[PDB]
Enzyme design. Structure first.
Site: not given
Ligand SMILES: c1cc2c(cc1CNC[C@H]1CCCO1)OCO2
Ligand SMILES: [Cl-]
Ligand SMILES: [Cl-]
Ligand SMILES: [Cl-]
Ligand SMILES: [Cl-]
Ligand SMILES: [Cl-]
Ligand SMILES: [Cl-]
Ligand SMILES: [Cl-]
Ligand SMILES: [Mg+2]
Length: 343
Positions: A26-27, A28-31, A46, A161
């Site tokens: 879908v999208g 500091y990290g991967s999600v 995440k 967030d």
């Protein structure tokens, strides 16, 4: 310990408990989006990127996990799960965070809908209800803006967030700066939780007009927009600005009075105009607080002082601790393994 399964999704290895199915990036990290078969919820998973690569990053990982574990409120994002595939501290490397999957944000409503005054009342009420809770734990969000507010079809809202930004992210014609209080935008002084109320004022103005309140093309352009609306500072506020240079610059500007907000927010509910005048005050000592704003007559239809809870105490003393990477990593591991899921 659950059974984990591995898979590669967009050049990244994901190792997660069997309960999480149908992972989709879908999208500091991967999600990824996933279906949680234990709860029936659609969730966001995440995977943190390099959580322990430096002392700064290891401390940031611990800070984020401590914050998400604490937040238990209807108008604030909560933690559904946290896991690692590691079986011991010695092999601990990866951290995964699980939250409810959020659909639209306030931008997907502000830009694409027609809002009555009743919608504005309900949306801003919920932001302030969440902020009363956050501020009661001496937490400052620091990054409130429409893309950090999730909203569903029933106009129900959650804050997400938390501020846990670079010089370049704040430069130019960018929404990342348009909602920031002037004292933090220009580093005037040590800031506190009052910065979040400035942001709520900017958001509420935008819901009422459909337009950004202070869309500056840079820091200086934005300050000029702000001072035109609320007036240039008096000697009382000038004394509170620590930078001699910032004080010098402010005094270089021609003095301006506060504008008439009824002539800016044309046709708005007079009670909405009154509340905006109490949020958008240059001197942060004099801004209305979240708890005070909930009792303002603009929210009379929704305010219930028996249904506006405060938070459990939140210990942030770790923030002044000087630890090694492996000590921050061990602290994070302890918080992963002690997590208890919500009801
Ligand atoms: C322009 C001039 C201004 C200003 C803000 C702007 C830029 N935003 C436009 C207005 C549309 C109603 C509220 O936002 O604040 C004082 O003077
Ligand atoms: Cl499982
Ligand atoms: Cl939640
Ligand atoms: Cl691991
Ligand atoms: Cl935004
Ligand atoms: Cl005016
Ligand atoms: Cl506290
Ligand atoms: Cl605590
Ligand atoms: Mg965001």
């Amino acid at each position: 310990r659950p059974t984990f399964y591995r898979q590669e999704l967009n050049k990244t290895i994901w190792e997660v408990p069997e309960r999480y199915q149908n992972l989709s990036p879908v999208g500091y990290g991967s999600v990824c989006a996933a279906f949680d078969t234990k709860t029936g919820h659609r969730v966001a998973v995440k995977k943190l990127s390099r959580p322990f690569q430096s002392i700064i990053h290891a401390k940031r990982t611990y800070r984020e996990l401590r914050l998400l574990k604490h937040m238990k409120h209807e108008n604030v994002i909560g933690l559904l799960d946290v896991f690692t595939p590691a079986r011991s501290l010695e092999e601990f490397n990866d951290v995964y965070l699980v939250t409810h999957l959020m659909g639209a944000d306030l931008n997907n409503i502000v830009k694409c809908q027609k809002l009555t005054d009743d919608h504005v009342q309900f949306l801003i009420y919920q932001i302030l209800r969440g902020l009363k809770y956050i501020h009661s734990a001496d937490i400052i969000h620091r990054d409130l803006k429409p893309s950090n507010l999730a909203v569903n079809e029933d106009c129900e809202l959650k804050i997400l967030d938390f501020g846990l930004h670079t010089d370049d992210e704040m430069t130019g014609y960018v929404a990342t700066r348009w909602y920031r209080a002037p004292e933090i935008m220009l580093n005037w002084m040590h800031y506190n939780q009052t910065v979040d109320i400035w942001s709520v004022g900017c958001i509420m103005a935008e819901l009422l007009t459909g337009r950004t309140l202070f869309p500056g093309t840079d820091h200086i352009d934005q300050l000029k927009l702000i001072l035109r609306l609320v007036g240039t500072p008096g000697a009382e506020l000038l004394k509170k600005i620590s930078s001699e240079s910032a004080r010098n610059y402010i005094q270089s500007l021609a003095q301006m009075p506060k504008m008439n907000f009824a002539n800016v927010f044309i046709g708005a509910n007079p009670l909405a105009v009154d509340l905006l005048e109490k949020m958008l005050v240059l001197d942060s000592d004099k801004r209305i607080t979240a708890a005070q704003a909930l009792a303002h007559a603009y929210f009379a239809q929704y305010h219930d002082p028996d249904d506006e809870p405060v938070a459990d105490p939140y210990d942030q003393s770790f923030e002044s601790r000087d630890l090694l990477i492996d000590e921050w990593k061990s602290l994070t591991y302890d918080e992963v393994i002690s997590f208890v899921p919500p009801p």
